[PDB]
């Protein structure tokens, strides 16, 4: 599923991501935008053999199991495919764990290189939340 911006913001908010660990909703939406372009089915192979899955490009070496990432951990205890569902519940729950890991949203390379320090509020402008 390819979410609309305001649609994703609404879902992310309902799921409790707004201000989660101090990150305003705009940060989350911004990250999703540059990580997957709001596409829950987005998958990207990484040089290390792992693969990023879903709307927030959750990695298979640490967070989910895809059956082809040696030395993987599956910290979110979930098949990576669950991170591709139209129902972002799995991605959100997993994301919550990732952001709480210690480096905050810096865990999302796209967020750090394209969202961090910018006016992320712009990502939720016009949305009815």
Curated annotation (Swiss-Prot):
Catalysed conversion reaction: Hydrolysis of (1->4)-beta-linkages between N-acetylmuramic acid and N-acetyl-D-glucosamine residues in a peptidoglycan and between N-acetyl-D-glucosamine residues in chitodextrins
EC number: 3.2.1.17
Entry keyword Signal: yes
Tissue: In the egg white and polymorphonuclear leukocytes.
Keywords: Allergen, Antimicrobial, Bacteriolytic enzyme, Disulfide bond, Glycosidase, Hydrolase, Secreted, Signal
GO cellular component: cytoplasm; endoplasmic reticulum; extracellular space
Designated gene of the protein: LYZ
Intrachain disulfide bonds: 6-127, 30-115, 64-80, 76-94
UniProt subcellular location: Secreted
Domain C-type lysozyme stretches: 1-129
General remark: Lysozyme C is capable of both hydrolysis and transglycosylation; it also shows a slight esterase activity. It acts rapidly on both peptide-substituted and unsubstituted peptidoglycan, and slowly on chitin oligosaccharides.
Record text on subunit structure and interactions: Monomer.
Species this chain originates from: Gallus gallus
Lineage: Eukaryota, Metazoa, Chordata, Craniata, Vertebrata
Active site: 35, 52
Pfam families registered for this protein in UniProt: Lys (PF00062)
The protein, known as: Lysozyme C
């Amino acid at each position: 599923k390819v979410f609309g911006r305001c649609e994703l913001a609404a879902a992310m908010k309902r799921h409790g991501l707004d201000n989660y660990r101090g990150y305003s909703l705009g940060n989350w939406v911004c990250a999703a935008k540059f990580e997957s372009n709001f596409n829950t089915q987005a998958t990207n192979r990484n040089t290390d053999g792992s693969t990023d899955y879903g709307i927030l490009q959750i990695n298979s070496r640490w967070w989910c199991n895809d059956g082809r990432t040696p030395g993987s951990r599956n910290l979110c205890n979930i098949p990576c495919s669950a991170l591709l569902s139209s129902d972002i519940t799995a991605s959100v729950n997993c994301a919550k764990k990732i952001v709480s890991d210690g480096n905050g949203m810096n865990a999302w390379v796209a967020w750090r290189n394209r969202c961090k320090g910018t006016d992320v509020q712009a990502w939720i402008r016009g949305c009815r939340l």
